[PDB]
Design a protein around this nucleic acid. Sequence first.
RNA 1: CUUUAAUGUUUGAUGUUCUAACGUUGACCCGUAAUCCGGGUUGCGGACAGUGUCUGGUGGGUAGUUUGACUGGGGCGGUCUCCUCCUAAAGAGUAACGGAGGAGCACGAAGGUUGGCUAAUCCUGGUCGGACAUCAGGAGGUUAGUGCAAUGGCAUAAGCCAGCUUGACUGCGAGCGUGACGGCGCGAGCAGGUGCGAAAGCAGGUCAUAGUGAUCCGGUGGUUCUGAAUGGAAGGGCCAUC
RNA 2: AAUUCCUUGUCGGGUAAGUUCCGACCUGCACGAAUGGCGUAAUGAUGGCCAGGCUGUCUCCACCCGAGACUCAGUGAAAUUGAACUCGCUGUGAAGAUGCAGUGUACCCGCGGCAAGACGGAAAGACCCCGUGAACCUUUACUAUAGCUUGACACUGAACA
RNA 3: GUUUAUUAAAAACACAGCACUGUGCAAACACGAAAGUGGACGUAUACGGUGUGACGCCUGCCCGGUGCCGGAAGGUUAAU
RNA 4: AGGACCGAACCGACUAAUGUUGAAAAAUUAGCGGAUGACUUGUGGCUGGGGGUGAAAGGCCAAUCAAACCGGGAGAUAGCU
RNA 5: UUUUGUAUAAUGGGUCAGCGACUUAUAUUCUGUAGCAAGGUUAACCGAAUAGGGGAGCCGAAGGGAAACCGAGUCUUAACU
RNA 6: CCAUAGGUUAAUGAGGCGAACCGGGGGAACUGAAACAUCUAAGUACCCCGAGGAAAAGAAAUCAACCGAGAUUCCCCCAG
Lengths: 96, 50, 64, 79
Amino acid sequence: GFEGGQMPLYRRLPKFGFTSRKAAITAEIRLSDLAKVEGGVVDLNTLKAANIIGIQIEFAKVILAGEVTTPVTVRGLRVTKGARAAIEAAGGKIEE
Amino acid sequence: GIREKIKLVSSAGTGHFYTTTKNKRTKPEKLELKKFDPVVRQHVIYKEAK
Amino acid sequence: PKIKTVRGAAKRFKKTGKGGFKHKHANLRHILTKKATKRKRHLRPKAMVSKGDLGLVIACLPYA
Amino acid sequence: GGSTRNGRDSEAKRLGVKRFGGESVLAGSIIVRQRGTKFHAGANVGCGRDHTLFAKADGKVKFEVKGPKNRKFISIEAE
RNA sequence: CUUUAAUGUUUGAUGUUCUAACGUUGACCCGUAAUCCGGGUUGCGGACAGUGUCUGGUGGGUAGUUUGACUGGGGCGGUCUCCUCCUAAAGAGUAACGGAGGAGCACGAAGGUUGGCUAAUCCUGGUCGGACAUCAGGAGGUUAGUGCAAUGGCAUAAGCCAGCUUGACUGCGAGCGUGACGGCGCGAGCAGGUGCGAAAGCAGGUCAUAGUGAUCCGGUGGUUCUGAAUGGAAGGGCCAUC
RNA sequence: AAUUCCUUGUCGGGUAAGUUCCGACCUGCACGAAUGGCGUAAUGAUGGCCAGGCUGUCUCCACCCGAGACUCAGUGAAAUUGAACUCGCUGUGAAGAUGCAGUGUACCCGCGGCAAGACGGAAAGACCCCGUGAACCUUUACUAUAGCUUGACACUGAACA
RNA sequence: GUUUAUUAAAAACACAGCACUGUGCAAACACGAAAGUGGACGUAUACGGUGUGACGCCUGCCCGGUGCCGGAAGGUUAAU
RNA sequence: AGGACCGAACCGACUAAUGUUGAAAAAUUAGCGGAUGACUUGUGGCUGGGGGUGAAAGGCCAAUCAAACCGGGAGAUAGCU
RNA sequence: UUUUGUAUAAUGGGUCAGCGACUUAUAUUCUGUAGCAAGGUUAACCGAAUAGGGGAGCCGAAGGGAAACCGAGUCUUAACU
RNA sequence: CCAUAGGUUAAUGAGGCGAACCGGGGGAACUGAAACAUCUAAGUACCCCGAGGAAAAGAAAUCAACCGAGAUUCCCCCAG
C-alpha cells in the first residue's frame, strides 16, 4: 500500500473490530444439496455424521436455494419462512 | 481562549444534543433554544449550558 | 510459509456480493462542533476499491 | 514576503455557450460575483450561494440574440 | 459551635536501662612454632550498624539518538495551510528567493421574516459647535455602508429604521463543479415539527469567497446491538460526540 | 600590545632611507589585581634590532686533486604501454586541435646534453557543496541510568520518663 | 626539567611559597555481578580534591545569574 | 655540600645538507645540546582492552590506537556509483 | 560504458588463454492448457509402497446488516418511501 | 569434654578428550520499522556449567459448558 509517503489511503480509513464471533460453531446448509437425507431425519446430531463440517457445530441454519425433491423431516435448526414453505409444498415436516 | 465548548440537552437528558462556542465576557444569560426531537417528533427547549 | 493477512487492511476493508472491497468514509468522528448534519449523514453510504487501487491490497488480503 | 500564495483557483468559468449541454444537467456560465454580466432564464435561474445556473431538467442551451437591455437571459431547452 | 490542658492510653522521636536480632574495623588457644583465618572459648559495641527490597531527591560517574525542505556556495532573513491580488502570452494548462495584502474569527444577532428608509461631501446662511459633528437652501453622491482584507455586487438593496422570534432542526435526495487522489464547492425537492406574514410567499443561518487538521489513542450522553459455563458486570459496537 | 578600525597611532632616538628595534605620550573599538597585577637576578637547542669578526654568502668567477655522469665487459631489476605515417602558422571547436577547413616546413636511424610541452608518471582530490550517510566531541536538545542522599517496609527485641 | 617517537620544543605543565574545601579514623576518597584491598601498619603541623607560582612591591568593587552551605515566614512535596 | 663548570664515555634530536626501491622504513655526513642528576643501563617480575601507561601528545600498548593483533556476527547498511 | 554536445588536453584499455553475474519455494493476478462439473480436490500417512486407499480440511454452490436479525432478498427509515 | 576437622583400610563414584543433536545459566551490535526512542534484531551470534541415546514432555490442582473431551510427542490441518 505504499504511495510515495503522503499518508496512504489504508490509514485514512477508520478502524473496525466488532464481529458476529460465531462462524466456528455455526453451520450453513442449502436445500439445493445434501437435502435428500437418504430417508433419514435432518437433525444437528446426524449433521455431525453427514461427511460435512465436523463435530464443533452448536447451531445449524437452512437457506432456500433450488427445489425440494423429498417429503423431508426436519427436527430443530434455524429455518427461514421461505424454506419452511418450500418443504411444506414437497410434503415434508418441520418439528419446531 | 479556553472557554470550553457548550453542550445543550433536552429535559429528558437523551443522547441527542447540540455543541457550540460562546463568548465568556458578554450576555451571561443561559444559552437555551426551542428545537426538534428526532424520535418524539416535537419541539422542546434544549438547555443546561455548563 | 503461508503469507500473512495484513492488519492495515483486515481492520479496514470487508467483502461483498460484487468484485472488490467495501469500506466506510472518513472525516465523521473527530470534532463535529463545526459539522452540520448535511456534512455528517451523507458520509454513511460506504464505497468500493475496484481499479488500480485494488492492486495495492491484492497481497494485503491474500485469503479474502 | 507575503508572495506568492494565491491558493485555490475555484474555477468560476463559462459553459452556457453556443449549443452546449445534452443528456445530463448543465451548471451554465459561472462568474465571480458579477450579477448581470451573464444573466439567466427558465429552468437554470439557480444562484443559491455561488451563481451556479443549475436545473431539474436536461437539454442544450438556446443561446439567443434577445434579452432585456444588455443582459443575455440564457436558458436550456427540451429537444 | 468553641479554645484546649491533665489523669489514663496508642505511637513517631529523644534519652535512659537491659540482652533475646546483629557487627566483630577485639583477644587467646586448637588446626600448627602457619604474622592468613576455619574452628574453640571469652569479651566489646548493641537494636546503633549491617543486609535485602521499596521511595522521593540530586544527576554525563555511564549509555543511545535526533537536530527539515524551497532559493544560481553555505547561512541569516523570508516562506511552508486557508482567503485575496498582479504576472498566465484574449482557449484549457503554467514558471521566476519574480511583484503584494489578509485570516487561523466574531455574531443568538452582524440569523429568519412582515412593514418602512437611502445614504459620503462641499458651498452659503445660521449657534456656543468643530477643515465637517443639531438645521434650511444651493451643488453633489454604489466617491456612503457591510463584524475584518482584497476584489466583485448591491435600492426588485445583500446597506439600516422598527416588530415578532429560531428553518443556527431530525431523517431522505436527481445530481452537477474542481484536483492524480484524499479532500474541497453548489444543489431542485419530500416527509416531520418550528419561525415571520392577513396572505401570496420565504427561511435547513451570517452579501460572496478565510477563522483550518484524515487515521490512531483516550473520554462522555443514550442503548435487549453484543457480552466464552450460566446470569449480571467491566469493556466494545450503533447513534450523539470531545 | 601575539589586545586596536584609522596604523607604518604620534612626538622624539637609532639609519643614506627603516611598515621592522627603542624612549615616551595614553580615544585599552573591547588591559587590570591569587583562571592574580607587575619588574629584576639566574636560565634557555628562547624572540627582535645595532655594531666588530669571518669570509667566493655576494660583487665577477677561475684554476688545482678526487667521485659519478661518459665507453664497454660479466651479472641484469623499477613506475609506465588505445593505436602511433604524433611537424609549424591560421580557422573551426566539449567554445586554448599532433591528426579536421586553409596555407607553409622536414633525409632516416641514432647520440651526448637540455626540458618549453605532450594539460607526463604516482594518490578512487584533499578544495566547496551535496546525502532523514558514518563516528566521536559539547550542552540551558530528547529519552534512559549508576553514585550519593531523604524517608520507609522487613530480618529486629523488653521497658520507663 | 617535561609534552606533540616524523612538518612544533617556544611563553604550555612541573614546581619551594601562598590560599580554599572535604575528612575524628570501620576518615574523607577509590576499584567491585564482591568479597577483598588500597588510603594507612599512618592519624588534623595527617590524608583526599583544587586555584595561584621562588623571593619581592602589592593584591579595587560586585552574591543580580548558576553551584554549594546555613536557615523555617510562605508556595509545594513520595512510599505507606 | 653542589638539579656546580670545562670535557670523553653515556645520553640528546636543536639545525643544515646528501637521501627518499638509498647500505638503509631515523641511517649517512657536518655542525651541536647535556653530561653527579628529575643521570644512565642489564636480568627477572608487575599493569590488559574500555582496561592499562603518560611532569597528558590522540602521544604509548609489537611499525596500528580520537581505540591494537587474530576470527565470528555478515552476503551489516547504501532511495547511490 | 556513460553526462545538453565528444576526433576530443572527458573516462578506460601492455597482451594471450581459463573462469565469471537471475536460482525455486510460499501467496497471487494475467495467459496458455487439461480432467471432472454443481460440484472439484486430497494433505500428512498407509500401501509388495509412481496404482490403490486416506475427504481431515480447504475451495465453490446466497446475499443484505455494526450486530441482534432477515434471506432470494436486505440495511437505514414513522416508513407508507 | 562427648563430637567434629585431620590420620587410616575396604568398597563405590568424579578427574582428561571428541562430530552433531540436547538440558540449565549468561548474552550483543549491526539489522527490520525506508529516520528513532516502545516493538523487532535476539535469548540469535558467542560464552559458561553439564546430561542422554536421545534430551525436553507425560498418566491433569487441563480444557470444556450442560454436550463432554481426556496422558506425552512429531507430521498434515483447524489458520495466517
